[PDB]
Amino acid sequence: APDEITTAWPVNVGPLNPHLYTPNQMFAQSMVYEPLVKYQADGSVIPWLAKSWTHSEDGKTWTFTLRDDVKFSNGEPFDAEAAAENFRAVLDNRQRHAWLELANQIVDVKALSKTELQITLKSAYYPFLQELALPRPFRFIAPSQFKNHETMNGIKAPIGTGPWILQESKLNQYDVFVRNENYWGEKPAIKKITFNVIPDPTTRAVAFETGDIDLLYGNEGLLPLDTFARFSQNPAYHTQLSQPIETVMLALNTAKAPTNELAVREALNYAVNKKSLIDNALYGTQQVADTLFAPSVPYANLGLKPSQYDPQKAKALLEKAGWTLPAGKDIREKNGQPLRIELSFIGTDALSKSMAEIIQADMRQIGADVSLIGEEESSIYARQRDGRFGMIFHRTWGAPYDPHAFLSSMRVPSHADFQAQQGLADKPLIDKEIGEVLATHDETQRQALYRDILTRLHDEAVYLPISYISMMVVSKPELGNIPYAPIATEIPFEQIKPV
Ligand SMILES: N[C@@H](CN[C@@H](CN[C@@H](CC(=O)O)C(=O)O)C(=O)O)C(=O)O
Ligand code: NI
């Protein structure tokens, strides 16, 4: 059936609550729910659910003129009342969204007519419009699907305005989406998409070459990298790599020994032979990362010094910090205690598992004993949130989060950064300066603030940058060339065309 496609994903899409996080998958929230304004590859936004808008002299009050022709997928109208109700449900759970500064800025959301929605901020918050465009939390479920006039405690049906409708959800088996034939924009050419829930990356690969699935669209790590490289040589498949979009790095816990020592974290940054890891384990499909953000990230081309591969420097740094080698033993000890570190990652990620292996062996070469721990994604995120990790795999967030929303998130438990930074004496300063860089309209001062924040995080070796990864695609040749969505976690199913 040509206008239907089957694909695969490590987990289910989740309840598809538009205002909550994992277990909801962002690509799926974005299929069903839509923003007021839509993010573009060039960095701007365009009208979406909001046809047009104005704002006050001081920039604190924004009036949005909504379209009069949008319906939720069950036929109910999307209007200013519905959007206000959504914003109210979101901000009734405001603390959950404190990582994103817009959630701290919205004082009031008023419906003025059926088509006029007024949003009031406590300052002229320049990233306003980009954060409204994100996959979550500021997208719209029909108010009829609230539970007790809230969404923070669950939803009835995942009824959005978008071009896809969640039709069926079988746990640990599949999810099914059908086209919304009453979508207000372009009717997608695909009629139905089935997601098979396949957590093992080898089984996803086999699912593809048996022909059981048509497409794989995800981060590097959705397939074994050696399989993907062979797929790319096979004229019977089609494959793609986008330009790099995210950093993959380890967060090092400056709060827990032994990673709370600067000398230890610097040694670990010298320990990994990244050029070999990339050229070998990852098949040249990435680039060596020396900093938390790539030089191409806005405000991030700071000329920071890289830590290149230097086992001998690493050993010297450990010696001088009192981690020495007993006689006839490979693992350093200090004051009776061997140098042991725990390295946790999401088990279903082929890239994380594969890098964890190389990293472990590289760090043993300098006398550090690293234990690998692979777990379900919910357990890894909870670890990042509460500080229970030694070294934990991490990644930045792509456009448009990088750098401003990623930094904003460092100020509360979010991903691993807040907890990983608790050991830094200048952590409060960094957080103060993150708040300033999000508030300033002075271009010169905005660059100064980014440089200082990013140079402090670099100099104190909070991260072990590994590589800058790309989006990866595998598809039947019939689907032709697949486009990329400007937001890294979204999948542009509505632009795919059958033969
Ligand atoms: N992802 C974890 C924690 N999520 C963070 C916020 N991160 C953003 C961006 C991203 O993850 O690409 C988001 O998730 O929408 C928070 O809750 O502060 C979860 O689902 O809980
Ligand atoms: Ni997140």
Residue numbers in the entry: 2 to 500
Pull verbatim passages from the article behind this deposition:
The ABC-type transporter (NikABCDE) imports the metal from the extracellular environment through a multi-step process in many bacteria, including Enterobacteriaceae and S. aureus. While a bacterial nickelophore dedicated to the NikABCDE system is currently unknown, exogenous environmental l-histidine is believed to be a widespread ligand. l-Histidine forms Ni-(l-His)2 complexes, which exhibit a strong affinity for NikA for efficient transport into the cell through the NikBCDE ABC-type transporter. Previously, we identified that the fungal-derived polycarboxylic acid natural product aspergillomarasmine A (AMA) is a non-antimicrobial metallophore with a preference for Zn2+, Co2+, and Ni2+ ions. AMA-metal complexes target the periplasmic Ni2+ uptake protein NikA through high-affinity interactions and compete with Ni-(l-His)2 for uptake.
E. coli NikA (22-524), which shares 75% identity and 90.5% similarity with the K. pneumoniae ortholog, was purified for crystallization studies. Ni-AMA adopted different coordination geometry when bound to NikA compared to the stand-alone structure determined in our previous work, indicating that two configurations of the Ni-AMA complex are possible. Superposition of the Ni-AMA structures showed that relative to AMA’s l-Asp unit (l-AspAMA), the penultimate APA2 and N-terminal APA1 are rotated by 93.3°. The interaction network between NikA and Ni-AMA revealed that the conserved His416 residue occupies the axial position within the Ni-AMA complex. This observation suggests that NikA either conformationally selects for one form of Ni-AMA or that Ni-AMA binding to NikA induces a conformational change to accommodate the Ni2+ interaction with His416. The remainder of the ligand binding pocket of NikA around the Ni-AMA is composed of Tyr22, Met27, Trp100, Tyr382, Trp398, and Tyr402. Notable CH-π stacking interactions occur between Trp100 and APA2, and APA1 and Tyr382. Extensive electrostatic interactions also occur with the carboxyl groups of Ni-AMA, including hydrogen bonds with the side chain of Arg137 to the α-carboxyl of the l-AspAMA residue. Ni-AMA induced the closed conformation of NikA. The structure of the NikA:Ni-AMA complex shows that AMA metal complexes are reasonable Ni-(l-His)2 mimetics and that full NikA closure and high-affinity binding are likely facilitated by accepting His416 as the 6th Ni2+ ligand.
